[model samples]
Target: PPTNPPTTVTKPAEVPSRIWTYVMNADNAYGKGGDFALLLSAVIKKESYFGDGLSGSPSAGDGLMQVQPNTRNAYLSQFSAKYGHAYNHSSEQDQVYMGSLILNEKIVRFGSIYSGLLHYNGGDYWYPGATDSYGRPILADQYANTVYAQYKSYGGRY
Candidate 1:
């Protein structure tokens, strides 16, 4: 049988080992790990530089994953509604978990990790056909590409 969760983690130095555990816990809640866990790592790196940023958490509570403002609580609450669970936005671990939850939903909704990663960042313009106030088509996939590049760099084997 193949490994359920691969033993390796990308750039573990820059990211604290506990973060890996948090992501593992979150990813494992769905189905256990492989590429999805690695993708979360790249997103965390890109969003928070491995949790090194002014965007606070577990105390100040801000955009560690680029999740911003008091509105951050909104997502946390929303997740509770969707997943039938609770989350603390102020907690870094929960923040990371929330990200995984959202990413998984996006992946399932869009039918591909590529689009999942895309819409996870794209917000209202997440879809390829989505356009902005200026009426220019949104190139939402750039985020997915950026994240995917780092994902590949960070040992996203899939």
Candidate 2:
């Protein structure tokens, strides 16, 4: 057995001092800092309102990220491969950790945060429809806008 080393995390201005710990720690666990963690806050905000409303069954996804259960297990397999340990979906921290990984992977896959976010919702990069902010044809316009609003609130520059 060995002790884990310290991980430095920068706090985003808009995030509350309390729950920011989970975001930061999950950032370290996911091996990214600054930008991605900032985005994660917004995604969590978008997903579960910063853990306010939990969803899914014990047979499915729960908490901040709201990823499905089967998908979660797949990510955890990758998690153990990277971190040499395991994560549970039973807690907010774990949820954030998994969520960060999911978003990160999607970003890598689609080559941009916005595209990845679209993929996160419908598992695709093109969303065609209308809204109150109507007639915007892009990769899932509504979700991107909502998540972007949350991101901008967190001092996100992109």
lDDT of 2 by residue, 67-88 (tens): 7666787787887675566887
Candidate lDDT scores, in order, read 0.69, 0.67
lDDT of 1 by residue, 1-158 (tens): 34436564443455578777777766767764445767888788766776675444332245456564543566766778755678776677778777777778788887887888877776644676777443656566777888888877777777
Number of backbone collisions per candidate, in order? 1, 0
Leading candidate by lDDT: 1
Q: Considering summed lDDT, which 10 consecutive residues are worst modelled in model 1?
A: 54-63
Runs of candidate 1 with Cα error greater than 4 angstroms are 1-13, 55-61, 69-78, 81-85, 126-140
